Structures are given as C-alpha cells and as structure tokens.
Design an enzyme around this catalytic site. Structure first.
Site, PDB file in Angstrom:
ATOM      1  N   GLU D  26       0.849  -1.185   0.000  1.00 13.05           N
ATOM      2  CA  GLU D  26       0.000   0.000   0.000  1.00 13.05           C
ATOM      3  C   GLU D  26       0.885   1.236   0.000  1.00 13.05           C
ATOM      4  OE1 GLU D  26      -3.462   0.484   2.136  1.00 13.05           O
ATOM      5  OE2 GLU D  26      -4.103  -1.616   2.129  1.00 13.05           O
ATOM      6  N   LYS D  39       0.304   9.099   8.002  1.00 12.25           N
ATOM      7  CA  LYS D  39      -0.230   8.081   7.106  1.00 12.25           C
ATOM      8  C   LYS D  39       0.621   6.819   7.119  1.00 12.25           C
ATOM      9  CE  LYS D  39      -2.902   6.102   4.277  1.00 12.25           C
ATOM     10  NZ  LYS D  39      -3.118   6.618   2.898  1.00 12.25           N
TER      11      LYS D  39
END
Ligand SMILES: [Mn+2]
Ligand SMILES: [Zn+2]
Ligand SMILES: [Zn+2]
Ligand SMILES: [Zn+2]
Ligand SMILES: [Zn+2]
Lengths: 49, 96, 98, 1407, 49
Positions: D26, D39
């Site tokens: 990801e 994040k």
RNA sequence: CUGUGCG
C-alpha cells in the site's frame, strides 16, 4: 571591605573576631593555626601578632 | 652548483663548520672575517638566548674572537652597567 | 623611496646578520650550510632586490641562494680565485663504437 | 502509485499472490513529513491488524513517497497538471478545497504553522465554552497595586498566627546535633544483624580480598610456550567467526581438535611441558582453555572428539581442505589439523592432572579479614588492582559471543563446571586468575573466581553481578587511589583526622565499586543534600524522610554505614569538631558526589520502565484525572470531558486561607491574579515590555486537537544518577508544536532578565551574585521544586498567558496569544502512550499504578494504552514555558518578600531549581517565618518546594554548583567519575579528544595534575588493550597546568611529541623552521597558497617542501624524515561497525542547528581487532598484520620511544602506514602559533626549587595572545574552503545551504592564517584546530592550586630578531621627525590626512 | 595606463589634488606590497563603483 | 555484527 564577620575557618563564629589579612578570624582558630605554623592556611599569609 | 653531475664515486663529504667565527674545514682554521657590533648589538644578542651556560660560553668566546677584530667603539658607559646584569666577571678577566 | 632612506640602511642589515651569525656560532660548533643561514631571522639578504652588496665574504653562496641551491659546504675561499689560475692537464682516451 | 511500487516489483493497493503467501503493498504520497509519518503509521497499523485475522501469512509493504517524483517522460506532466487542477478549483468544498492546496506547495509555503496562523476554522464543538468557564473565570489581571499590597499584609498577618505559630511551618532550624543523631539513626543501621566487615557482607569484596591476600602472600623458555599457545589460540579464534563451516557445533569441535593436537604436540619435544608451564600458565583442573573463552574438560573433550570421527570418518581431511581453500593466510597450523590426536597420550595427560572441578556456588561467621583499617598502604592498592583485573574480566565476559553447549546438562545449588566460559586475568609471575561463567550476552550472570598458583586451582569464591556495571574500575586502579589521596590531603589541618578518614574513604570507594547499585547513588545524593542542610541554618522538615533508602541487601547497608560513619567522624564533636569547616564541607560533598562512580545504565530496563510509568501515573491517580484512551482523535465522550473539567476545577480550587492543601497539585486563582497584575504594570523585576516579538492535515483545529493527531507523546526514562528522569518522545507534528512553544517562551525569556536556563550570560551573572552574597553573609536560599514536571499543567500556563500583557517594543499593542493559547490547550489534551513492555508486564501480574492498571483492565473499559491528564506537563516538553512561569511567580514572591519583611531579594531560576539571595537589613531564626511564608505562597502556586531545598548564610547551590564563603567547591569526584565514565569509544582519536576535553574541564574545576595524568594513563591503557597499540598522539601523560591553562589540545600534542623527543635537538630544529616560516608568512611577504599546493601531497613531500624553505639539504631532510610512526588511519578512517576529512564533518554538524559505556568499550575492542585498517585498495586488514611487518631496528633511533617511533628502513615491509612524526610536530607547532601565539617556539625552561601546602587554590586566566582576528566566523572558514578547495567545496560540502550569497560576496575576505593553517587541519585527522577556533574556551577561568603553578614549566615568547628590528622608540621619533620636517616646508592641517599618508606612521602597528 | 595618467595630470595643472591622490596610492601600495593585510577586502570595496 | 587484547 573584609568578610562577613565570620571566622572563615570554623564557619560558625561571629564574636570578638580578629582580621587575618582580608577576612576575619576567631581566637581559638587563630591560636590553633599559630601554635603549629606561621601561615594562615585560609588566605595563605602570615598571621598577625 | 656543488652537484657532482649525476655521478661520482665520492659524494657527501668534507663538511665545513664554524666555532669561533673561523672556518674549520676539518679542524684547521682558515681565517676570520671582520664583524663589528659596537657593543649595543652585543648586549641585544645576549638578551635573547637560552640559558645561563650558553651566555657563559658566548661571552667567554667573545674576546678571543675580538682578538681577530678591532672594535673599541662599544659604549663604555651606562650601557656597560646594563650588560653588568650578567655577572660574568671571570669571563672578562679570562682574556686579560 | 618614501621612507626617506630610513628603513634599515642595508649596510646595517648585512652587518646585523653577520653579527648574529658570528655570535650564534660562538656558543656551539655549527655547520655553515644553508640550514644555519636560512633559519636565521636577519637573513633578509634574499630581500633587497638591489643585490649589489652582500655581507662580507659569502657573496657566491647568496648568489646561489638566489638560484635556490641545496648545497651544504665546500672550500668557499674565492679570495684565492678557484675558477682562475687552474691547471689545464687535459687529455683523452679511446672510444667504444655502439 | 504506479511509479512508486514499480521501484519495488509491484503490480497495477497492490497484491502479489504466489503459492500460499501474499505480498500486500500500500502506497501514499504526502510531501509534509508530519502527514507523511501520520499516514505511514496509520497504514502500518491497519495492515498489521489484518494478519491477526488471516493467520487463524502476508508480506506487508508501505510506500510513502515524500514527493511526486516520476519516471514516465520527464518532470513535465506531474506538477503542472496538479497546479492547473488547483487553478481550476480556484476558478470553479471548503475544508477539502483548502486541503488540496495546503498539501502541496513545497513543505512550508502556506503550510508550516508558525505562531501567526490561527486561520484554520476557529470553531467550537460544544466543549470549549465549558473549558474556558473552568479555566478563565477567575482571572482579572487588572487589579491595582495598593489592594494587592494590603491583601498581602493581611495574608502575612493570618499566616504568622495560624500556620506559623501553630508549628505547621515546612522549614525549621538545623539543630546540628539532632541532624547528626537523625543521620546516624537512618543510615547507620543498629538493629541489623549484618557484620561490621565489608568483605563479609559483599561477596565481590570477599572475592577481591581473597584474590589479593592470596596473591600477595604466596608469590607477589618459561614464557615461550605460553605465548605460542596464546598465538595459536588467537588464530583459532580468528577462524571461529568467519563461518568457514556449515554448523557452529562442527566449528567448535574442529577448533577443539586443533587445540588438543597442539596440546599433544607440546607434551612431547619437552621434558615437562604441561606440569611446568600449563600449570603455571593457562590450564585448570582437568580442563583446558579453548576458543570463544570456553574451558572444556579434557576427558569430555576427547570424548566429543571420538565422535564425528568414528561416526563420521574422513572428517579431518575435508574439514581442513575447506579451511585451506578459504583462508591460505592462517595456514600456520601445520601439525594440528591432523588425524586422531593420539588419544592414549591424551588420557594419560588427563589422568596426570586430576584436580577438583570448579564448584560454581549458586546459593547465597568468622571474620578473618585483617581489619582493612589496619592494612599497609600496599595491600589497599593491591586490592584496587585486583578489583581492576576482575572488572576487566567481567567486561571481557560480557564480550563472549553466543555459542552453544556441546555437553548435556544435568543452577539449583551447585554446578560442576565442564562447559563454561572463562576469562583469564594475569596477576603474578606464577599465579593467574580465572573467571568462570555459563551465560553470554549482556545480562546479569553468576561468576566464579578461582586462582592458579602452580596448578593448584584454589577456589576464591562465587558471586552474582551485572557485567556492564563494572567499567569504571577497569583500569583506574591509580585514578581512584589518587582521588582518595588528594581527598585525604584536603584534611591535612588535623594530623590524625586524615589518618582515620583515609582508610575509611578507600574502603567506602571499594565498596561502592564492588556494589554499583541505584540505591547507593540515591543514598549518596541524600547525603549530599544532608550536608547542604547541615552547613546552612534552615532546612525543610521532611529532609530526613527523603534521605532514607531501603537497602534490600547487606551490600547497601555496609556502604551506608561507611558513609554515615565518615560524615559523623567529620562532623560529630562538641568544640574541636569544625576546625577547618571549608575543607570538611569539600570532603563531604565529594564523598557524597562519589555516587557518580556508580554508572547510570538501568540495571533492569523493564523494572525502570515500570518505575517511570509509576512516577508518571501516580500523581494523576492521586489527583483524579486519568482518562484512558479518550479518543486518539480529539472527540472526548461525556464522561471524559466531565472528568477533564473536574480535574481543571480541582486544579483551580485552591483557596488562600487553607493550609491542608499545600501539597496537592494546583494553583490559587487569587494569588495568580495578584502575580499577573503585579507583572503587568511593571511592578516586578521583570516587565511585560518585551522586545523581538517571538511570533515567527491540520485543516480544522479546536481546543483538543487539529485533526492531525492529538499531540501524542510516548513515555520513557532518562538515565540519571539518583533517579531516572521522565522522558517524552513525540511524533513529528507534536514535536513541531513543542518546538513552537519553546521558541515563543525562549524569546520571551530572553526579553526577561533573571531567567538563566539557556542564557550563559545570565547564569554567570547569577554565579557572581551568589558568590558575592555568600561572601557578604546574605541569606542564600537554594530552592528545589519536587515533582516540577508531574505537577505542572498546560492549563496553568494558559491561565498565566490569558492576562499577560507581553507588550511589544515599538508598537505597544499587547499582541494576542491566541495561537499560543490554542497550542497550549492542545498540550492540555495531550495523549501519552504507555510503554508496551509496561503493559505486558502489568498483564502477567502491591502498587498504585498496578492497582489502577487492574482496575482499568476490564472493569471500566479495555486494556489501558493511552493516558490524558490536565496536570503533568512533560519534562522537556514545555521547559521554557515552565521557566517563564516560574520566573514570573518567583519575581512576584520576591516582591512579596520585599513588601512584607522589608528585605532585598534577588532570584535566579532554571525551571527545575532556583536560588534566592536575600540581603537582610540591620542566627537566621527571625527569618524562619519569612521562609515558611515564601514556601506557603509557592505551594499555593504549582511550585511545591522540595525538602531537598536549603536556606542559610554559609553555602549556596545552583545547577549542581556549590558556592562557599571565599571559594567554590571543586567537585573533584564528580568530574573524575565523568572522566572514567561516558567513554564513547568509536575512534581512538575521538576517544582521546573527548577525554582531553573532559580533563581540561576538570582541571578548570581544580581537580589535580597528578590525577589527570593517571586518567590519561588509564585512557592510553584502554586504547592499548583494544589492540590499537600506542601512538605518538592520544592522551597526554606527565602534563602541567600550562598544558591546559593557556593551552589547547594542539599544544598538548606538541608537548607530548616533545616529551617523546628528549634532549630536543630535532624537535628544536623543527620549531626553528616553523618559527622561520611563521615570521615569513605573518610578517606578510608572499606566503598564502603555495603552501596549500605543497601540503596536499601528504606528510613526506609536504615536510620536505617546508624544509626546503629553510636550508634543509638532502642531509638534514633525511635526518628529519627518519622518525616515523605507524598511522593506521592513513588511507582514511578505521572501519568499525570518499572519506572526506573530519573538518567537513564538524562544519556540517555546526551549520545544521541507550547503550552502556561498557557495551561501547566492548564494541570498540571488538572492531579494533577485526579488519579495520584500510590499505587504500578497499581491502581492510588487521592491526596485527600491520604491526607484524616491523623489524628489530635498535639503531638508537627506534629506542627513544619503543613501539611508538620507528625508523625509515624499519618499516620497509609496511611503508604505506609510515608517516613522519616530525611533520605532524611541525603542523602542530604552526597551528599553535596560529591559535595561541608565538610562545610555542621557545624552549622549555623549569623553575628551580619551587611549599604551597597542596591547597593554595586560586583562579588563573588563559594567557593566550591569539592572532586569528578573534572572530573566526563560520562564513570565513567556508569562504576559505571555497577559495582553496573548490572541488571539495562543491561536492561533499554545501548541498544543504541557502546562504551561499553571503559566503560568496567576500565576507571579510582572506582572514589571517586561514589558508595554510586550515590546510594543516584538513590534512591532519588528529590536529583539529578549526574546531577549536569556531568555539569559545568554555572555561574562561581555571581554578588551580599554587603547588602546580610553582611547578609549571616556563615557556614565554621570545623575539627572534634579538630586539633589533626598529627599537620602537626609534619608530616614534622618526615619525615625529618626518612630521616636523614636512610641516616646516609648508603649512599643513594636522588632520588624519597628514598622519595616515605618512610612511613612518607605523604606530597603527606594534600591538 | 601611464599615458592616461599623464593626460589626467595635464588636466590637473598645478597638481595639488592629483598629487594627493598619488600620495594616497603610494600609501596603499606601501601597505599592500610591504605585505601586511591587503588582498581581498579591496575587491569588496571596489565592486560598489 | 562478530573480540583474544591486563605481564
Ligand atoms: Mn538547587
Ligand atoms: Zn573559628
Ligand atoms: Zn587569614
Ligand atoms: Zn569479615
Ligand atoms: Zn631504528
């Protein structure tokens, strides 16, 4: 100016002090440092008479 | 130059030295060349030195060298009293 | 000259260097190489572009120091001319053909 | 995303399934490091939470791209498309329309939130109004002065009759007799059954005594076969860690076979080999020493050898072929790696030496110990040497690599050792000691010490200890001896008192070293505070309650008894007990600071983490605001906001007429209002008229968070001497917020006057004021504040800054602190992550924190992992803000003291401890009420005065600096222990540089000249023990005070090289050449940058060229270059786990803005034995192979300093590591001429006879005559590097620079001695002058004893011209004559024009 | 350069100003040639105009 | 990631 009216040797004496060369000094400390040597061991100067 | 031109069986020998203002090739005195100091230069040299015995040697070897020179112009006045700071009476009384 | 001929009077320069050399020699035996000349303060003889006058006797070694020589010591007694009045016992030998 | 995972073998977030394993990748793109890390951690968390459900495996990869870099066409459609897209958005949402542009400018353009950006939402969430109602309801700040004055009068009237006359004061008189009785009652245990002998109580002291008095009474080709064995053992240990075999067990077995074959080869070809040298060397009862520090039973050794050759024939042949083909340099083994090692000779040898095996006592009387007091001055030093050897053996035991046990095991009470590791320490000519142990790593072990006199292995004992806590006494057998000797000499005034206090002090030091525990450190700190209270007149009532430390062992009881007995012997008595009380105070303060001898490295990491969490959460539980896992986003529930508002109200519900609340956290609203009112109208010593205003994705913000986290910190500890301090490690965004608040408060404090935390000018001012106050008899109050961090609250700083004026210097507009208040409200709602180890330790588990953990486990919610509170400001999080608050409150308290008691107070704070000098008008019994009232007012604020605070007129304390009437306590033991500890050994040059800095800063504080040389000897011995060998550089031995006073590290190295060259005829010649070169360059002439071309070659050619400026012919040059030294770091730096010089490194470090010391020394000795020396071609080789190429020169040039200075021909086999030591001496002399004047050229002369009693201490100033323009800015060194080394200025330098313009436009172009004197630093990796030139002296004064200055070597600058240059009298008279004779040709104005335009106006010269 | 110098001197008859500038230049040259400290501060001082 | 170094 001299010290704060303290013996500077025993640290606890504010009474009938005698000045050595720039500080004060009590009677018993003066006699003790005088009966063994001629120096002061605090200011490293000859003690008064 | 002194170079032996890129080859030679004999090299790096015959050293010239100096002890009392006299050129010593191997131990033989060649000559002494005259030098004037007028005294004040002498004491100015005496000032900047290393220790006491160096001063003793340099002042004892002076008048023997002054024998090969002629200089009395050195100020025999208060300048000599200043030089008197180095008490070397034996040295000045050794050449007689 | 803007100094009104008052800087050092190069005669004084050379006589002071000579005096320093002599009075430093008369404390211990020292080799008269360039080491005991270049390592001296008053060896300003490399200065004073007008080099017509050297100290007393070592004119040739100073001229060689102008060429930056690495010599040490020899018989520098040119008062008796070593370049002149020299024997000319010259001769030759055979050859070896390549 | 495609361009990002294409770099990591990815698809088109990303799945890669092959067989029965999937790789999940990801990615994300955030240009701000804050949101980048946010994040990153969020993706890691939500990808790690999934494998717990899929396993009932996946390869997780997260790809955060800090930019939008691509590789599709070229840098064209990446940013232009985004720019035009946001442009279209501008042409045609609200929070997202701002997020899209705030997310990408660069990192800072309209994105970095400095303290002028409150334009996000400024919105409410139905919680801020209640917060402000519970935070800013009682703040007025506009109160008049007369009302505050009369209120203070009435408050003092109430306090004097209701809290002071009732005996509820927290301070009292000393009663020195009662103080000594309480000290003897708390420290000197009388109800304990422990013996009055340190050796009986401490097992390690017992072992040291046994080894000492068994080695001193018995003893203290014979040394040929032992060295042969040691050499082949080193060779086999070399091939132990190369993995030249398949399995570790086979490697150990093959090395055992080699050692056994060596044994059988030594048995023959000699009359008595094992019975004469093995018994006297390295062998024990029935067992032989092997690789990996192991000792194996010869019986079981040959039993294991019988296997793998009978069950696996033809093993020796291939096991030797795999070694010869892999390392044909260690093939010195010629008859060892052979077939069966003559098994019958082996068993006959074994049956010859049949002795008892080590017992390894695992389980924890008569007192035959010779009564250490009555021991000769030699047995005590022998005890210290034995402790040193045993500690070094412990450190080497920690060095053992993790091996495997080849024997089967049968730790309950005893273990007959057969497969144990052992460290061998040489003690005497015949006896050697062995330290056996069965564990590896860095954990605590149970060691067993044995001896071997002539083969008779006698048991010395067994003990249990942690190895990484015995690094200080490793080689300091003389350092601590000299420390104790000088401490005893301090008491020379009473011939007899020193005679009793000497052996007691040595015994105390020995017990402290043999038992390094945090409890002893805490007890010695308590003794320090006790002495501080004893010397003065007023002390806290809870003082003795804080000096007690639970022993939990007799090893602590003995050291406590020793310390208390020493204090009593120095203090007890009626009249003749305080003869020289200054010496007594110094002695006792150093004895208490002896706690620094014990290292601070968390004996148990998990236990200290638990203790830190306890100290962090106990105040919150006791207060009542301990909301757990509130939101992790900033959305508090109803109960959470309720408990937060209740905590705020309880923090602001402290009245002014109640004495039952002088200990709970909080602040009085009325007293804070009076403080703010007196601060606003310039009534306090600090004023609100400040200068240099400090004002200089997070889309929606509120009082709780900003939707970019919740100001998340994480809890941890910081290793300190007494107790582990708190520590908070925050994420990027919260760290930036803390940085913002810190800059704001720091600028405000710089606008203030009496705050001294990061302003050394104000600290020196406070030092001088304290000194003059102690000299004039003023009342010095050394105040400490207990639980400053855990009690301070961001809400308190909010309430303070709510009505602070903080007026501008030019505008006078009362700048609003809305952003500062917002970030402080964020800090109020911070979230502290508890340690995961603490949580897992509490889950598998009386204690208040443990009770709270059990209560919050499942009764209320889920497992506790996050803690929010109103109080407990993070220590180091709001440090300058806490300093500002404390300064304001303390100035208010000083004004209150001046108002009520008519005294003159002046205070200096440091956000942890403060000092108040009170000049009294017109003992110290009438000022007790003033001290009690001051403490009461402080407790009404959040300034709870710690019981460690003292008040008196004899000695003051500030920032661990004690000031005494007429002098200052040197704190000798503190600095000596700092020199022995914190040895960060990465490179021996860096090691010695750090040690030299520490020794300089210690000599500055009057330590000694005889202790510093012993510290230097210890450091040189540490470097030599690492296999590096002695170098001409390193620690300076046999030094003088003049080597530290008016002397830098370069001068110390110069003096070291001069000491190497006795009867200096060569170094004197090099100094004369350097003086000639300096007279040529300084005097001006033409010497700037040809020297740079001449130096860049190296050491040989540079020295030759510099000698060619003098008359150094090929005769003197070769005589100079004959002195060489092996430089291991010649072709770069040593490899330890394009090599630009360290000058570039220090410049980069200066322009930009957990492991134990024993582990560091272990890693240093480990990396200094592997392939570290580089040969230029990339192939690292050992130091042994470098030092093996040396030959026996012994030609009177390699004999003036053995193993340090070598000849030119003596290094023909290894000439690459051959550098001239005289070139380094030349460079050092030239750099010393740069830095500290011309006196580094004269020869050293000595004073003749000089009687100063070793105690004539006085302050001396550095006599440096530095001629480097005294500024030496960074932009000067950078410009000089750009000019001289442009190819080195472009690459490896200035990639991270935006101020190249000022460094380019000739900023003071061509500073004096910054072209060649920077080259000497750039080419010499051990000189380092520019690092000292870009720095201050850091001492500016040196306390030294006159006995050292009378012994100081005399070396003054001497003019080389023999006073013949111009005789400046002639200079001035010639200028006067020129002026007069030029005036008498025409009338001229006597301006500077007719003076500067004159040649002989050299008066601007002649310094 | 010497021709331009002579032209400027011919412009300044009875040279009391160009003589002063020449004296200042001689002072600066005695300061820079004689060595002392005069290399690159002059470059910073000249670049203005 | 890898050490044999207290004489
Ligand atoms: Mn304090
Ligand atoms: Zn007295
Ligand atoms: Zn005195
Ligand atoms: Zn005992
Ligand atoms: Zn030699």
């Amino acid at each position: 100016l001299y010290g704060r009216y303290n013996c500077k040797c025993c640290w606890f004496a504010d009474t009938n002090l005698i000045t050595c060369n720039d500080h004060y000094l009590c009677l018993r400390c003066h006699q003790t440092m005088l009966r063994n040597s001629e120096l002061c061991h605090i200011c490293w100067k000859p003690l008064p008479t | 130059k002194y170079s032996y031109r890129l080859s030679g069986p004999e090299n790096q020998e015959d050293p010239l030295v100096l002890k009392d203002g006299a050129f010593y090739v191997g131990g033989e005195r060649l000559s002494t060349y005259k030098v004037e100091f007028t005294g004040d230069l002498v004491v100015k040299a005496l000032g900047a030195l290393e220790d006491d015995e160096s001063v003793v040697s340099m002042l004892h070897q002076l008048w023997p060298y002054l024998k090969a020179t002629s200089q009395v112009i050195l100020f025999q006045q208060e300048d000599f009293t200043i030089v008197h700071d180095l008490y070397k009476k034996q040295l000045t009384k050794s050449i007689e | 000259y803007t100094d009104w001929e008052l800087g050092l009077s190069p005669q004084q320069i050379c006589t002071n260097f000579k005096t320093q050399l002599v009075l430093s020699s008369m404390v211990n035996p020292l080799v008269l190489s360039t080491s005991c000349l270049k390592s001296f303060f008053w060896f300003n003889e490399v200065l004073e572009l007008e080099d017509d006058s050297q100290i007393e006797l070592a004119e040739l070694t100073d001229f060689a120091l102008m060429v930056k020589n690495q010599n040490v010591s020899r018989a520098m007694f040119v008062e008796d001319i070593a370049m002149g009045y020299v024997v000319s016992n010259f001769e030759g030998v055979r050859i070896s053909l390549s | 995303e495609l361009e990002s995972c294409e770099a990591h073998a990815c698809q088109a977030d990303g799945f890669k399934l092959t067989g029965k394993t999937l790789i999940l990748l990801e990615t994300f793109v955030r240009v701000n490091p804050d949101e980048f890390e946010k994040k990153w951690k969020a993706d890691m968390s939500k990808l790690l939470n999934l494998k717990h459900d899929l396993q009932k495996t996946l390869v997780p990869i997260v790809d955060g791209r800090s930019n939008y870099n691509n590789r599709f066409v070229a840098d064209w459609v990446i940013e232009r498309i985004r720019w035009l897209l946001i442009e279209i958005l501008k042409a045609s949402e609200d929070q997202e329309y701002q997020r899209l542009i705030h997310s990408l400018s660069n990192v800072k353009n309209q994105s970095l939130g400095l303290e002028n950006l409150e334009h996000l939402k400024r919105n409410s969430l139905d919680y801020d109004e209640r917060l402000n109602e519970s935070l800013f309801i009682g703040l007025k700040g506009d109160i008049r002065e007369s009302t505050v004055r009369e209120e203070l009068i009435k408050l003092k009237l109430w306090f004097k009759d209701e809290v002071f006359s009732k005996g509820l004061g927290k301070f009292k008189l000393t009663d020195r007799r009662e103080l000594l009785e309480s000290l003897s009652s708390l420290g000197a245990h009388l109800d304990s059954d422990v013996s009055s002998c340190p050796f009986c109580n401490n097992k390690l002291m017992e072992i040291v005594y046994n080894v000492t008095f068994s080695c001193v009474e018995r003893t203290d080709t014979h040394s040929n076969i032992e060295k042969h064995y040691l050499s082949v053992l080193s060779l086999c240990n070399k091939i132990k860690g190369l993995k030249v075999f398949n399995t570790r067990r086979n490697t150990l077995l093959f090395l055992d076979l080699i050692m056994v074959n060596l044994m059988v080869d030594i048995s023959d070809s000699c009359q008595d080999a094992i019975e004469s040298l093995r018994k006297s060397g390295l062998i024990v009862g029935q067992m032989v020493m092997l690789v990996n520090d192991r000792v194996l039973d010869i019986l079981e050794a040959v039993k294991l050898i019988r296997k793998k050759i009978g069950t696996n024939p033809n093993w020796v042949k291939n096991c030797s072929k795999i070694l010869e083909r892999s390392h044909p340099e260690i093939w010195h083994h010629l008859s060892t790696l052979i077939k069966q090692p003559d098994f019958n000779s082996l068993i006959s040898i074994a049956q010859h030496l049949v002795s008892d095996r080590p017992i390894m006592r695992y389980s924890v009387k008569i007192c035959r110990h010779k009564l250490f007091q009555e021991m000769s001055s030699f047995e005590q030093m022998r005890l210290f040497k034995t402790l040193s050897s045993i500690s070094l053996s412990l450190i080497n035991s920690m060095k053992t690599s993790f091996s495997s046990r080849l024997l089967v095991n049968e730790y309950f009470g005893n273990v007959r050792l057969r497969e144990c590791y052992a460290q061998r320490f040489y003690l005497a000519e015949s006896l050697v000691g062995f330290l056996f142990y069965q564990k590896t790593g860095e954990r605590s072990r149970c060691y067993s010490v044995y001896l071997s006199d002539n083969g008779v292995m006698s048991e010395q004992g067994s003990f249990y200890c942690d190895p990484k806590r015995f690094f200080l006494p490793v080689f300091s057998d003389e350092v601590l001896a000299g420390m104790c000797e000088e401490m005893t000499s301090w008491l020379d005034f009473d011939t007899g008192l020193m005679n009793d206090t000497g052996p007691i002090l040595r015994l105390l030091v020995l017990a402290i070293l043999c038992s390094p525990s945090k409890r002893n450190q805490t007890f010695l700190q308590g003794l320090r505070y006790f002495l501080m209270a004893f010397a003065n007149q007023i002390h806290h009532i809870d003082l003795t309650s804080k000096l007690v430390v639970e022993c939990k062992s007799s090893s602590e009881v003995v050291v406590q008894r020793l310390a208390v007995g020493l204090f009593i012997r120095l203090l007890s008595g009626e009249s003749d007990a305080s003869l020289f009380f200054s010496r007594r105070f110094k002695y006792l303060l150093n004895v208490s600071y002896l706690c620094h001898l014990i290292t601070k490295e968390t004996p148990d990491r998990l236990t200290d983490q638990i203790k830190c969490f306890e100290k962090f959460i106990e105040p919150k539980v006791k207060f009542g605001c301990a909301v757990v896992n509130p939101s992790l986003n900033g959305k508090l529930t109803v109960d959470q906001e309720d408990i937060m508002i209740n905590g705020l109200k309880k923090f602001f519900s402290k009245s002014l007429r109640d004495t039952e609340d002088v200990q709970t956290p909080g602040v009085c609203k009325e007293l804070l209002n009076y403080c703010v009112s007196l601060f606003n109208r310039g009534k306090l010593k600090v004023s609100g008229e400040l200068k240099n205003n400090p004002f200089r994705s997070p889309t929606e913000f509120t009082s709780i968070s900003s939707n970019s986290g919740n100001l998340k910190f994480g809890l941890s500890y910081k290793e300190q001497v007494g107790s582990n301090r708190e520590l908070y490690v925050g994420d990027l965004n919260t760290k930036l917020m803390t940085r913002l608040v810190e800059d704001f408060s720091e600028a405000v404090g710089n606008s203030m006057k009496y705050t001294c935390l990061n302003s050394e000018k104000e600290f020196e001012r406070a030092i001088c004021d304290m000194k003059m106050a102690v000299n004039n008899g003023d009342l010095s109050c050394s105040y400490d504040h207990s639980k400053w961090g855990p009690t301070m609250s961001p809400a308190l700083f909010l309430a303070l800054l709510q009505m602070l004026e903080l007026r501008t210097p030019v505008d006078r507009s009362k700048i609003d602190l809305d952003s500062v208040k917002s970030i402080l409200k964020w800090h109020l709602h911070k979230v502290v992550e508890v340690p995961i180890n603490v949580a897992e330790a509490y889950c598998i588990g009386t204690s208040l924190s443990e009770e709270f953990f059990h209560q919050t486990m499942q009764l209320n919610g889920q497992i506790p992992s996050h803690i929010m509170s109103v109080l407990d400001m993070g220590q180091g999080i709001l440090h300058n803000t806490s300093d500002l608050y404390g300064l304001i409150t303390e100035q208010f308290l000083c004004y209150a003291l001046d108002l009520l008691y008519d005294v003159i107070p002046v205070s200096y704070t440091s956000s942890d401890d403060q000092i108040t000098l009170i000049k009294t008008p017109s003992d110290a019994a009438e000022w007790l009420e003033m001290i009690c009232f001051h403490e009461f007012l402080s407790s009404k604020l959040n300034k709870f005065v710690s019981p460690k605070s003292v008040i008196g007129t004899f000695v003051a304390e500030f920032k661990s600096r004690f000031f005494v009437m007429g002098e200052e306590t040197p704190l000798l033991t503190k600095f000596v222990a700092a020199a022995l500890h914190n040895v960060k050994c990465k490179t021996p040059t860096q090691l010695s540089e750090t040690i030299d800095t520490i020794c300089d800063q210690c000599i500055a504080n009057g330590v000694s000249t005889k202790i510093v040389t012993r510290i230097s000897k210890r450091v040189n011995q540490l470097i030599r023990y690492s296999g590096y060998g002695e170098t001409p550089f390193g620690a300076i031995e046999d030094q003088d005070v003049k080597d530290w006073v008016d002397g830098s590290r370069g001068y110390r190295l110069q003096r070291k090289i001069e000491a190497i060259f006795h009867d200096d005829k060569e170094t004197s010649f090099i100094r004369n050449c350097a003086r000639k070169v300096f007279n040529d360059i300084k005097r001006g002439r033409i010497f700037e940058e040809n020297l740079i071309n001449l130096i860049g070659r190296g050491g040989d050619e540079a020295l030759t060229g510099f000698l060619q400026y003098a008359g150094c012919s090929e005769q003197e040059v070769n005589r100079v270059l004959n002195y060489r030294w092996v430089n291991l770091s010649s072709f770069g730096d040593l490899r330890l786990v394009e090599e630009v010089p360290t000058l570039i490194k220090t410049l980069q470090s200066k322009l930009s803005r957990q492991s134990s010391v024993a582990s560091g020394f272990i890693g240093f000795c480990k990396s200094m034995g592997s392939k570290c020396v580089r040969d230029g071609k990339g192939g690292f080789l050992y130091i042994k192979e470098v030092y093996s190429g040396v030959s026996a020169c012994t030609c009177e040039i390699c004999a003036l300093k053995p193993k340090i200075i070598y000849c030119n021909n003596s290094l023909n086999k290894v000439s690459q590591f051959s550098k001239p030591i005289l070139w380094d001496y030349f460079s050092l002399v030239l750099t010393n001429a740069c830095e500290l004047g011309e006196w580094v050229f004269s020869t050293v002369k000595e004073p003749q006879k000089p009687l100063n009693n070793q105690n004539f201490f006085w302050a001396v100033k550095p006599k440096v005559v530095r001629q480097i323009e005294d500024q030496l800015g960074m932009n000067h060194v950078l410009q000089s590097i750009r000019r001289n080394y442009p190819v080195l200025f472009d690459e490896h330098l200035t990639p991270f620079m935006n101020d190249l313009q000022v460094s380019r436009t000739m900023d003071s172009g061509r500073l004096k001695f910054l072209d060649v004197c920077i080259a000497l630093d750039m080419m010499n990796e051990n000189l380092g002058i520019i690092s000292h030139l870009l720095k201050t002296r850091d001492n500016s004064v040196y306390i030294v004893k006159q006995s050292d200055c009378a012994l100081a070597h005399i070396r003054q600058s001497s003019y080389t011209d023999w006073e013949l240059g111009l005789s400046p009298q002639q200079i001035c008279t010639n200028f006067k004559t020129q002026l007069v004779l030029s005036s008498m040709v025409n009338p001229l104005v006597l301006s500077t024009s007719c003076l500067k335009s004159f040649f002989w106006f050299n008066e601007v010269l002649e310094l």
